[model samples]
Target: EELFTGVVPILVELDGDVNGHKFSVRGEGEGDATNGKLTLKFISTTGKLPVPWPTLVTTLVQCFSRYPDHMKRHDFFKSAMPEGYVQERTISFKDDGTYKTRAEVKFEGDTLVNRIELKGIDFKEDGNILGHKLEYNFNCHNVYITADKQKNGIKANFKIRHNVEDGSVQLADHYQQNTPIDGPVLLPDNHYLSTCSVLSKDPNEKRDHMVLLEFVTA
Candidate 1:
């Protein structure tokens, strides 16, 4: 029987193999997770197809930054100035709200198309780069998409939470009610939220590590 309390069935885990690598993408979550541990992993695999989009783009990260003088400057932009870049200096923020701190972009080419962000982000004092030292508590609504990918309406979305600090993330319960997505996605039926096609669904996708889908039934 289905639980009608509306407290279960939060599909936040997107498991599938792109190219030859397998990815178990689990985003952030709610309560008792004060400093929640956000995670992501990709490994070798064989089964293919049922991708949310032919050109899939997905990731979840924290306290991340970009160098204006380094890398592809055209690949990024600042929300504070949506039509520009931060040259000569570095930009940092702990909250994504007041202005939504983010560095948007994409990854194309190869079939696997590995993601571009990291979970529980931590910086070391080794090999020095450009600009000054960085510091921050976390990032809220830290999700980005490349319009270059799927523009097929709201067919799919990566399950996610709010704010990343320390080595964990935490989101509001009501706000966590299977939170809808912002950007456009292309979720094909029998793909996500269905086990009919999954070569592995835990029978393999560990729910304990996935807060949103943890409550979800198999």
Candidate 2:
């Protein structure tokens, strides 16, 4: 066999928008596919968004690490969601560019990381794990999540995936907010939802609201 050789570094870039909040990701990566460490700049395209949410994507690249170890099927991904790894809380939402709500995550009790065994996967990518497509499929019928104000009424079905090849990363999910209050939010003169509930004055309907996103990599 000829002598083993070093690999060439690839220019990885990811440019996309999540509900109109633009982001630009760029970094250098070498090696074919093994465990290694790499850091990329997660900045905003509009320049108004700002970067430095290190853990945001830092933990995400680890999600790819979350993939290989679990070894679940793409078809089975729908049913195989990592238990306890699922969270239903508030996260910042961007509506058109005018208004949204003030809300956020469950990195409260635990660290801003870990997906059940999330930390268990050390994000192998210093080199050996390059150029692979990391795909995440989440079942639909979702998004009206958060305790906020005015965005528009819409349906949510999503395409969440990124290119690990060019050092790409994608952040988008269909989630929930406003604690579940079973459909018929209106009842006679009895009145409900004033206390244990948060309200948004938009869609006349009263229930758990939902939202969507299209995160892609090129």
Clashes of each: 5, 16
Q: What is model 2's C-alpha RMSD?
A: 22.4
Candidate-wise lDDT, in order: 0.22, 0.23
Q: Residue 9 deviation, candidate 1, in Å?
A: 30
In terms of TM-score, the best-performing candidate is 2
lDDT of 1 by residue, 1-218 (tens): 10111211111234433222344553322211112222223222322322211011222211112212332222222121212111110111123211111222221221112222222112221211011122112222232222222322112223333223243442211110111123322222222221110111223743322111111111
How close to the true structure is residue 107 of candidate 1, measured as C-alpha lDDT? Answer: 17
Candidate 2 stretches with Cα past 4 Å from truth are 1-8, 31-35, 39-45, 48-52, 58-218
Clashes of 1: 5
**Overall local distance difference test of candidate 2:** 0.23
